[PDB]
Nucleic acid binder design. Structure first.
Ligand SMILES: [Mn+2]
Ligand SMILES: [Mn+2]
Ligand SMILES: [Mn+2]
Length: 391
RNA sequence: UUUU
C-alpha cells in the first residue's frame, strides 16, 4: 500500500548538536529481572593494570561455564523501560519532555546506515501522549538472527564455528576481567585478583536513560553502559562524562584489517556519540584469544582519526565520514518529527530501510498490529494510565 | 557480545 519515503541522499544543512544528559538509570540483575531502586549499585568500574595485561589473560577461559541469556529473552524491553519512566516521572510530577523515546541501538542503526547499506532496518513507530515510541520489530530480528546462525553453522567448519562462538564469549569475558563492582577504593585485593575465575554472565546490565537532541528534535534514549572510568559523580549533568564502552578486536596485521577496524570503530563512535559516552576501550587479542594490549580512545577524537588515516582512503561515497552520517541522522529524525501526527493515537507505523529496493519508508501498520503494540507489545496499561492521569 |  502507500508509504512515504525519505530519499537516502537526504542531509540536514547544518549540525546543531545538543549535549546529552542522563535522566535516570535502572538495571537488570543476574536472574534477568529489572531493578529500579538504587540501580547505581549495579554499575561496575574500569580496572585493568598493565601488570595484569602482561600476564597474558586467556579470554576464552571459562567458556564452558558461561551463563548466557537466551536471545528471545534479551530483546530490548519496552515494558521495563516504561516502568522505569513511570517511577521517574512520578517523582518529577511531570512527563519527560521529548519528541522521541527509544533505545540507543535503534538510532545507532540509523546513524551508521550510510556506511552499512546492506543492513536491513525494521522498526515500529507508535504515537502516544504527544510522543513517538520507537521499537524494533522483534519477530523480524529473531528471524534474521536464526537465519544468520544457520548460515554460519552451514558455511563454516566446525572449528571456525566454535571459534566464532568463543569470540562472542570473549567480549563478555573482557568486561568481566577489566572491571570491578565498586571503585578501586572500596574493592578488596581478593575481588581484584579473583576476576579471572569469576563465572561470566550476560544477564547483568546497567542501563542509562538520557535526554539528547539534534536540530530542533528532542530524543530520549535507553542504553546499556559497560562501566564507569573512575567514579560516578553526584552532579547529574556530569554522570555521562564518566561512562566507558568496552570492545574487543583482533590485533591488526594488514591493511584489510585496518579498514575493518575503521568500520568497527565508526560503529562504536555511533553508539557512544548518541549516548554521551566519552571513552572507548579496546582489548586487542591474538588468534588464540589471549589479550595482548588495551587501548583507550576518546570518542570526540575518533572523527579526526578516521578522516586522517592515510591507509583508509576511498571514493567520497564509500569513505566513512562522521559529519555526513550525522547529517543523514538529523534529516531522518526531523522527517519523523514533522511527518507523523503525534496526537493521532488511532494508528501505528512500520519504519523500514530496505537495502534491495534502496528505500527508507514509513507505512501504516495493520489494525491487529497497532492493537498489539498499544496493548502490551510496546505500550503497557500501567504506562497509559499513568500518562492519562497527568491530564 | 561478536568474525581479517
Ligand atoms: Mn555486560
Ligand atoms: Mn555493553
Ligand atoms: Mn561493550
Amino acid at each position: 500500500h502507500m508509504a512515504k519515503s525519505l530519499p537516502l541522499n537526504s542531509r540536514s544543512k547544518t549540525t546543531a548538536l545538543k549535549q546529552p544528559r542522563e535522566l535516570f538509570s535502572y538495571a537488570r540483575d543476574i536472574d534477568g529481572k529489572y531493578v529500579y531502586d538504587d540501580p547505581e549499585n549495579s554499575l561496575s568500574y574500569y580496572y585493568l593494570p598493565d601488570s595484569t595485561i602482561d600476564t597474558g589473560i586467556d579470554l576464552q577461559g571459562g567458556y564452558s561455564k558461561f551463563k548466557k541469556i537466551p536471545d528471545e529473552q534479551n530483546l530490548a524491553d519496552f515494558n521495563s523501560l516504561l516502568k522505569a519512566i513511570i517511577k521517574y516521572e512520578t517523582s518529577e510530577g511531570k512527563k519527560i519532555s521529548s519528541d522521541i523515546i527509544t533505545f540507543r541501538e535503534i538510532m545507532t542503526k540509523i546513524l551508521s546506515l550510510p556506511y552499512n547499506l546492506t543492513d536491513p532496518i525494521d522498526l515500529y513507530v507508535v504515537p502516544f501522549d504527544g510522543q513517538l515510541f520507537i521499537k524494533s520489530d522483534d519477530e523480524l530480528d529473531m528471524k534474521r538472527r536464526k537465519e544468520q546462525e544457520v548460515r554460519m553453522k552451514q558455511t563454516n567448519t566446525v572449528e571456525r564455528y566454535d571459534y566464532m562462538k568463543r569470540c562472542e564469549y570473549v567480549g563478555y569475558k573482557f568486561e568481566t576481567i577489566a572491571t570491578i563492582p565498586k571503585p578501586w577504593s572500596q574493592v578488596s585485593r581478593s575481588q581484584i585478583e579473583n576476576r579471572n575465575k569469576k563465572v561470566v554472565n550476560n544477564y547483568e546490565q546497567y542501563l542509562s536513560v538520557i535526554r539528547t537532541g539534534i536540530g530542533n528534535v528532542k530524543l530520549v534514549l535507553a542504553g546499556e553502559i559497560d562501566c564507569c572510568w573512575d567514579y560516578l559523580p553526584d552532579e547529574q549533568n556530569k554522570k555521562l562524562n564518566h561512562y566507558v564502552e568496552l570492545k574487543t578486536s583482533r590485533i591488526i596485521e594488514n591493511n584489510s584489517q585496518v579498514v575493518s577496524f575503521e568500520q568497527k570503530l565508526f560503529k562504536a563512535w555511533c553508539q557512544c556519540f548518541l549516548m554521551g559516552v566519552t571513552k572507548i576501550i579496546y582489548g586487542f587479542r591474538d588468534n588464540n584469544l589471549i589479550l595482548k594490549n588495551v587501548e583507550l580512545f576518546n570518542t570526540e577524537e575518533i572523527p579526526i582519526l578516521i578522516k586522517n588515516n592515510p591507509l583508509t582512503n576511498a571514493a567520497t561515497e564509500k569513505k566513512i565520514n562522521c559529519t555526513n552520517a550525522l547529517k543523514w541522522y538529523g534529516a531522518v529524525v526531523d522527517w519523523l518529527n514533522t511527518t507523523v501526527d503525534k496526537k493521532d493515537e488511532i494508528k501505528s507505523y512500520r519504519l523500514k530501510y530496505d537495502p534491495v529496493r534502496k528505500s527508507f519508508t514509513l507505512s501504516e501498520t495493520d489494525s491487529e498490529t497497532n492493537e498489539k503494540l498499544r496493548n502490551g507489545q510496546l505500550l503497557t496499561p500501567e504506562f497509559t494510565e499513568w500518562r492519562q492521569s497527568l491530564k
